Design a protein around this ligand. Structure first.
Ligand SMILES: *[C@@H]1O[C@H](CO)[C@@H](O[C@@H]2O[C@H](CO)[C@@H](O)[C@H](O)[C@H]2NC(C)=O)[C@H](O)[C@H]1NC(C)=O
Ligand SMILES: *[C@@H]1O[C@H](CO)[C@@H](O[C@@H]2O[C@H](CO)[C@@H](O)[C@H](O)[C@H]2NC(C)=O)[C@H](O)[C@H]1NC(C)=O
Ligand SMILES: *[C@@H]1O[C@H](CO)[C@@H](O[C@@H]2O[C@H](CO)[C@@H](O)[C@H](O)[C@H]2NC(C)=O)[C@H](O)[C@H]1NC(C)=O
Ligand SMILES: *[C@@H]1O[C@H](CO)[C@@H](O[C@@H]2O[C@H](CO)[C@@H](O)[C@H](O)[C@H]2NC(C)=O)[C@H](O)[C@H]1NC(C)=O
Ligand code: NAG
Ligand code: NAG
Ligand code: NAG
Ligand code: NAG
Ligand code: NAG
Ligand code: NAG
Ligand code: NAG
Ligand code: NAG
Ligand code: NAG
Ligand code: NAG
Ligand code: NAG
Ligand code: NAG
Ligand code: NAG
Ligand code: NAG
Lengths: 417, 203, 377, 148
């Protein structure tokens, strides 16, 4: 079939109609980013020549190749520790959460550490469960337990102190009051939080519950991290399978060549295996350099997400999931990181008649913040992102000039308190 | 007459254990769902080597002959199960059209209710035999299912084979150079296979 | 390290100077129990053979050629070769062995040798001087003729039947005395499969049935099928074998190997260094087993500090105070229980304007290479 | 040790050029790596066999160098795009992007040139000397709730 790009929607536009959301949903959207390849190094003399002296002497004729390969892979390996440390080590101190959990009704228990487990969170354990010849794999510098202490510190700082632990030493603030800042940071007047605090806490707690269900229901969510694990395994299996290839030599088993033939013919046949295996190893190292540049671009993105999106409140549209960004929580995962982006999504709009300005005594009044709307019979001023109708007053509005200049101005009283 | 081979005629391609793994290999195999010729006998071509099978409850089929002429001119294989042993020799034999049950030389060797299945092939001068035995519940055709054939014999004898015939409900089909994917289970038996050239899903 | 970096001065760091590789302690060879030896008694121990005027052929295949025993035994008085010597021939092979034999007076036997001269060499018992093997002979005066002489026999193409009646006699001189002789030339007729005892748990060089490698052989529980000889890993690599003399299965592990990595402060600061054997277990090599490998020449410490030189798996090392290299679990930072409660806020009463340098690279050295002048000068 | 990034960018290019020069001494299987040895010692039908080994090896050594310089130039371009983004948002403006313009609340930054690079002196407000206080989300007056 010819694909559909999406459902058609003729937006209900007219020069005096505005739709204002009367309600919201807090949404929590997982985002998953690769951060490190499997650190690898190849003993290229043992790979190419299999501890044969007759081959090892011939491989010296190729000079610096079986040395700049090890230097290239060592550059990739050190860069994976840098990538991991740029992402997680953004916190100066290992902050930790109090024994009490008076977070205004919000329930972080599924993302904070579980001391019965390493001491990963519940969701970090789901994430760690869903991912699954001279070649050597080197361990990461930070162990998975150290990564979990960093995500714990980032998370415990984020919960107890807001953005302040990025800008300086962490300053405590009550979590209801931190969310009241996050609401002002999206232009929603903070009383909208405190008046709806139980509802907002329930929407957050429920949305965290849906992450556990989503991560339990399918492995396909972690496709980005499992793809990185698969590509590392596929590359190493391809590099090993290429030892079996002839490259025009009489056998790929090097001890066959050294027993089938006289030394002059054997050196020619071995040089085909050296040339093919060396070209195979250069091909592998070149693909790993390009793949490491791809993972570095993802690690720099994840490091930028942790700085702007965890340690702060990014005002950058769709940088921190769909909806207006409130906060995000880092969770570790194999070879990567996961952000639980908490966002305000507006959800139950009403249509209203609107005007850019209002005439009183010939003076044209404009709203200081928010927009004018009418329920049909009366005129109100309202903040842009949540329907809260307020009487129009000389406090809510400022004058400029007179009625004649403004296209589409309307007449109403402005109450002077 | 002809019948459908189903998924039969696969054999262990090499003397190697592999476990819980899928191995892709090119060898002379009976193609899946091929036309296996049925007999109730004449001399037959050998081509790229032969799958042979017989449904049994009687032990009346006993042996085979192979070569170019199968008579006088050159060394030719004779194979006979005589119930005391499997008896093998390669002489320049001469006989009537085929010996049957009343119910020079250079090498020698000695060692319906059921289906007996076999594969005979000749590569690098090695004449190879594979076989399998199973109970069955169908008389007129090979039963739909899977069972890999396993090697018996591996003779370094170097003879040219282009014809064969059978000494005595039997079936014949020709091997072809085809890629198969073989499912080795946790105990290193082949338990399923894909004939890659069969259909686009198999590719 | 100085040689690895091509420098007399070395900066602080960890450098992969070499690759360590456990050496094979000995060589193992295994083949099946010896069987199907070629029946040479019909030439070497038989009392008679075909006439020197009319020599007879012989052949063997699907058998083990006991040629080393044939060369070592006193059953032959002499031997000589047109091919390689019997010390090489005792390990030779062919698709079949081919031969010929005869009995005569000892000088008439010599007249039929490979490259000899006489009616035997001319046609009656011929053999070329370039024959692909060796010839041998022994005395036979007790069986090849009567006390009246071998007068019933005959005397003189290759390896087959220039001829007349025989005349060997046991009372005559060494040329007329009765004797028997044969010659042969050149897979199915090979020399014997010489085999060693089996060694487990050491790193060893090995041969099983003509596959070869180096590894640690170990007793194992993989259930090979009765016809299977070798086991393989997911990526082609041999990882088990059947011992051909006792049909149990040996799992093969590679001999331990890894990057020797030299942890050093700068050569300004010290000439003392510590060595990490990456991935190696210290049993295979002060000493400290890290999860990254065996670490030698650094003190393990129970304090924690910022990471100076990174080792891996949470370990770092530094040169510290009376001074030595130490190795420790890296400190992620000081702990801090934030003083949170539902009604406490901390507000800064002062500030510092902090100026922090950030450095970014922007351009490389612009190279251009005239590749015709680089390649061909 | 602060300028480790720029001095490493110099060192990577110097090591790459010196590796490419040292590879001229490699035989790749030829009778000599000095091309004039081959041309003086061997007649054309033999010489072209040995020179094909040097051409094949030296050409493979240039393809290795140029491949690594293309990947390194992509790394340096990613850093130049980042530095250009810093100069736009962080010198020419005041970025609200946390830790984009040094660790603190960003005020301004001053670009300074450096060989193969740029240096930003990020001036940032860092808060200090905090006091603990009792706090409330809102305050009652005549039954109505007041917020700041
Ligand atoms: C705003 O939307 C929420 C849902 O997101 C509404 O809350 C639900 O209200 C119904 C009854 O009207 C209950 O059955 C549900 O259990 C509530 N859900 C939750 C998550 O609490 C809420 O009533 C709406 N508020 C306004 C003012 O319209
Ligand atoms: C925070 O939420 C968790 C669940 O996300 C609550 O723990 C569950 O509580 C129910 C009812 O007692 C039990 O059936 C589950 O087995 C509990 N799960 C776990 C993993 O313990 C927890 O009680 C909530 N805490 C607060 C303070 O609201
Ligand atoms: C528009 O809003 C005004 C003010 O909320 C509504 O007027 C009030 O209506 C109720 C009955 O619904 C009366 O008890 C009040 O006395 C009215 N106040 C005033 C100032 O008139 C008005 O009904 C709304 N109109 C629509 C179409 O929703
Ligand atoms: C807003 O109110 C003013 C009066 O306060 C309206 O102005 C009158 O408009 C009519 C038609 O043009 C004239 O006859 C009157 O003389 C005007 N009076 C004044 C004082 O100017 C004006 O039309 C209203 N505008 C809208 C958009 O309703
Ligand atoms: C707004 O009103 C128009 C009709 O005037 C209607 O088509 C549209 O669906 C309405 N939108 C909402 C959100 O009620
Ligand atoms: C709004 O829509 C219609 C068509 O453009 C027009 O008649 C009407 O005057 C417009 N009103 C304003 C305030 O522009
Ligand atoms: C051979 O097999 C195909 C199906 O695989 C069938 O269409 C064809 O008729 C068969 N040939 C004969 C001679 O029956
Ligand atoms: C089977 O063959 C052998 C010779 O290979 C012979 O000695 C034996 O008697 C035969 N047995 C039967 C039952 O025919
Ligand atoms: C046996 O071999 C000879 C040659 O060695 C040949 O002349 C004869 O025809 C052969 N006979 C048979 C039955 O093979
Ligand atoms: C087999 O046939 C080929 C020609 O096709 C011939 O060269 C070879 O000698 C033959 N070998 C035997 C054992 O018949
Ligand atoms: C493997 O073999 C054992 C007996 O050796 C048997 O118990 C087990 O069920 C077999 N497993 C499979 C997958 O065939
Ligand atoms: C020949 O006879 C002697 C008798 O002592 C025996 O030791 C030897 O092994 C025999 N050799 C052969 C080749 O049969
Ligand atoms: C080899 O011979 C020994 C006795 O010498 C015996 O114990 C062993 O089982 C034999 N092995 C095979 C494979 O026949
Ligand atoms: C190391 O020695 C060099 C001179 O050889 C000197 O320039 C440098 O400052 C010294 N560095 C340290 C850390 O001692
Ligand atoms: C291998 O290392 C572990 C600790 O990592 C140790 O317990 C074990 O004893 C070592 N192996 C041997 C054979 O000593
Ligand atoms: C270091 O800690 C271990 C237990 O982890 C202990 O046995 C050892 O005595 C300690 N050494 C020092 C110097 O504290
Ligand atoms: C603020 O800190 C500075 C040093 O940074 C100090 O000199 C000054 O007196 C402090 N002012 C107050 C009001 O504490
Ligand atoms: C705030 O008060 C707690 C005790 O209630 C204390 O532990 C903490 O150190 C204080 N912090 C500051 C910055 O004064």
């Amino acid at each position: 079939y010819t694909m559909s790009l999406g459902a058609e929607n003729s937006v209900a536009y007219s020069n005096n109609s505005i739709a204002i959301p009367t309600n919201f949903t807090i949404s929590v959207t997982t985002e998953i980013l690769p951060v490190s390849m499997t650190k690898t190094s190849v003993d290229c003399t043992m790979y190419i020549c299999g501890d044969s002296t007759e081959c090892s002497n011939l491989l010296l004729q190729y000079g610096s190749f079986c040395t700049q390969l090890n230097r290239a892979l060592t550059g990739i390996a050190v860069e994976q520790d840098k990538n991991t440390q740029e992402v997680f080590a953004q916190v100066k101190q290992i902050y930790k959460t109090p024994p009490i959990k008076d977070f205004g009704g919000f329930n972080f228990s599924q993302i904070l550490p579980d001391p019965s487990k390493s001491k990963r969170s519940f969701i970090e354990d789901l994430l760690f469960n869903k991912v699954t010849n001279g070649l050597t794999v080197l361990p990461p510098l930070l162990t998975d337990e150290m990564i979990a202490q960093y995500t714990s510190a980032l998370l415990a700082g984020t919960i107890t102190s807001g953005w302040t632990f990025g800008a300086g030493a962490a300053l405590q603030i009550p979590f209801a009051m931190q969310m009241a800042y996050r609401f002002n940071g999206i232009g929603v007047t903070q009383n909208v939080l405190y008046e709806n605090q139980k509802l907002i806490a329930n929407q957050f707690n429920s949305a965290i519950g849906k992450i556990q269900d989503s991560l339990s229901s399918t492995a396909s969510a972690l496709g980005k991290l499992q793809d990185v694990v698969n590509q590392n395994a596929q590359a190493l299996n391809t590099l090993v399978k290429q030892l079996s290839s002839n490259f025009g030599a009489i056998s790929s088993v090097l001890n066959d060549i050294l027993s089938r033939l006289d030394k002059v013919e054997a050196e020619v046949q071995i040089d085909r295996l050296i040339t093919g295996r060396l070209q195979s190893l250069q091909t592998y190292v070149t693909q790993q350099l390009i793949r490491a540049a791809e993972i570095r671009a993802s690690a720099n993105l994840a490091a930028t997400k942790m700085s702007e999106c965890v340690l702060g409140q990014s005002k950058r549209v769709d940088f921190c999931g769909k909806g207006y960004h409130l906060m995000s929580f880092p969770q570790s995962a194999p070879h990567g990181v996961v952000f639980l982006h908490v966002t305000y999504v507006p959800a139950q709009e009403k249509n209203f008649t609107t005007a850019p300005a209002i005439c009183h005594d010939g003076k044209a009044h404009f709203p200081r913040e928010g927009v004018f709307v009418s329920n049909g019979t009366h005129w109100f001023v309202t903040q842009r992102n949540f329907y809260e109708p307020q009487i129009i007053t000389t406090d809510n509005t400022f004058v400029s000039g007179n009625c004649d200049v403004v296209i589409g101005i309307v007449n109403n009283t402005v109450y002077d308190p | 007459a002809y019948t459908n081979s189903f998924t039969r005629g696969v054999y262990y391609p090499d003397k190697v254990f592999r476990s819980s793994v899928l191995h892709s290999t090119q060898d002379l195999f009976l193609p899946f769902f091929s036309n296996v010729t049925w007999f109730h006998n004449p001399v037959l071509p050998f081509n790229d080597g032969v799958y042979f099978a017989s449904t049994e409850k009687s032990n009346i089929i006993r042996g085979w002959i192979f070569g170019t002429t199968l008579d006088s001119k050159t060394q030719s294989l004779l194979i006979v199960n005589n119930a005391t042993n499997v008896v093998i020799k390669v002489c320049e034999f001469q006989f009537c059209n085929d010996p049957f049950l009343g119910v020079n030389c250079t090498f020698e060797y000695v060692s319906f209710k059921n289906l007996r299945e076999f594969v005979f092939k000749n590569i690098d001068g090695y004449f190879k035999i594979y076989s399998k035995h199973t109970p069955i519940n169908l008389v007129r055709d090979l039963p739909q299912g899977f069972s890999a054939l396993e090697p018996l014999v591996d003779l370094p004898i170097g003879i040219n084979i282009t014809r064969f015939q059978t000494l005595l409900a039997y079936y014949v089909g020709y091997l072809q150079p085809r890629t198969f994917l073989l499912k080795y289970n946790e105990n290193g038996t082949i338990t399923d296979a894909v004939d890659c050239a069969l259909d686009p899903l198999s590719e | 390290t100085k040689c690895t970096l091509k420098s007399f001065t070395v900066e602080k760091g960890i450098y992969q100077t070499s690759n360590f590789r456990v050496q094979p302690t000995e060589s193992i060879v295994r083949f099946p129990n010896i069987t199907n030896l070629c029946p040479f008694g019909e030439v070497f121990n038989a009392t008679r053979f075909a006439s020197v005027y009319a020599w007879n052929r012989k052949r063997i295949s699907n058998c083990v050629a006991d040629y080393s025993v044939l060369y070592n035994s006193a059953s032959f008085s002499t031997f000589k070769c047109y091919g390689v010597s019997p010390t090489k021939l005792n390990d030779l092979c062919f698709t079949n062995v081919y031969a010929d034999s005869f009995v005569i007076r000892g000088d008439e036997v010599r007249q039929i040798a490979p490259g000899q001269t006489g009616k035997i060499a001319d046609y009656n018992y011929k053999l070329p001087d370039d024959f692909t093997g060796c010839v041998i002979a022994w005395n036979s005066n007790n069986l090849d003729s009567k006390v009246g002489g071998n007068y019933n026999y005959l005397y003189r193409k290759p390896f087959e039947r220039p001829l007349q009646s025989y005349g060997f006699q046991p009372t005559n001189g060494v040329g007329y005395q009765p004797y028997r002789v044969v010659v042969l030339s050149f897979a199915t007729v090979c020399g014997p499969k010489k085999s060693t005892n089996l060694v487990k748990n050491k790193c060893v060089n090995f041969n099983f049935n003509g596959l070869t490698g180096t590894g640690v052989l170990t007793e194992s529980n993989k259930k090979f099928l009765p016809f299977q000889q070798f086991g393989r890993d997911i990526a082609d690599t041999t990882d088990a074998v059947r011992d051909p003399q006792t049909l149990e299965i040996l799992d093969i592990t590679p001999c331990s190997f890894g990057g020797v990595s030299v942890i050093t402060p700068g050569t300004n600061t010290s000439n003392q260094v510590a060595v990490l054997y990456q991935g190696v277990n210290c049993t295979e090599v002060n000493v400290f087993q890290t999860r990254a490998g065996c670490l030698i020449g650094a003190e393990h410490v129970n304090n924690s500090y910022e990471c100076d030189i990174p080792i891996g798996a949470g370990i770092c090392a530094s040169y510290q105070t009376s001074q030595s290299i130490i190795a420790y679990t890296m400190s992620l930072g000081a702990e801090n229980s934030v003083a949170y409660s539902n009604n406490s806020i901390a507000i800064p009463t002062n500030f510092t304007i902090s100026v922090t340098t950030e450095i970014l690279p922007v351009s490389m050295t612009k190279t251009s290479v005239d590749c015709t002048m680089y390649i061909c000068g």
